[PDB]
Design a protein around this ligand. Structure first.
Ligand code: NA
Ligand code: NA
Ligand code: NA
Length: 134
């Protein structure tokens, strides 16, 4: 029941969340995405085990609005920021692109949170999956 950050983790496979909902995705491979994302919402993935330092994250995203950003934190939604990712308008809620951002994560096992940030006035993005790189 550990999660491997160096292979895709599906965003709907969260252990806790605040503010979001899931739906079926039109992205290739099918499956699901999280959506209805607003400024301050988050998702938690428990027991994510890094055997080696991570230096970036890659996230599969879509947005019909101006987008926003994803903060990577551990331990709690307020835990130290380890990196972030900018998410642009992609031309629609099921128009998918992969974005990346730097992180610094040392080996260990963590509760990983993706915390969504942007304007409070519109929903920000959809997320299919994410994966870290060393
Ligand atoms: Na929301
Ligand atoms: Na960044
Ligand atoms: Na997914």
């Amino acid at each position: 029941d550990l999660k491997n950050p160096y292979e895709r983790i599906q965003a709907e496979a969260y252990d806790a969340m605040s503010g979001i909902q899931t739906e079926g995705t039109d992205d290739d491979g099918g499956g699901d995405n999280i959506g209805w994302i607003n400024d301050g919402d988050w998702v938690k993935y428990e027991r994510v085990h890094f055997e080696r330092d991570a230096s970036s994250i890659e996230v599969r995203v879509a947005s019909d609005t101006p987008g926003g950003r994803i903060e990577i934190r551990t331990g709690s939604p307020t835990g130290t920021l380890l990196g972030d990712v900018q998410v642009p308008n992609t031309g629609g809620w099921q128009q998918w692109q992969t974005v990346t951002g730097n992180v610094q994560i040392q080996p260990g096992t963590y509760d990983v949170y993706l915390v969504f940030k942007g304007s409070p006035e519109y929903d920000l993005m959809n997320v299919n999956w994410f994966v870290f790189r060393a």
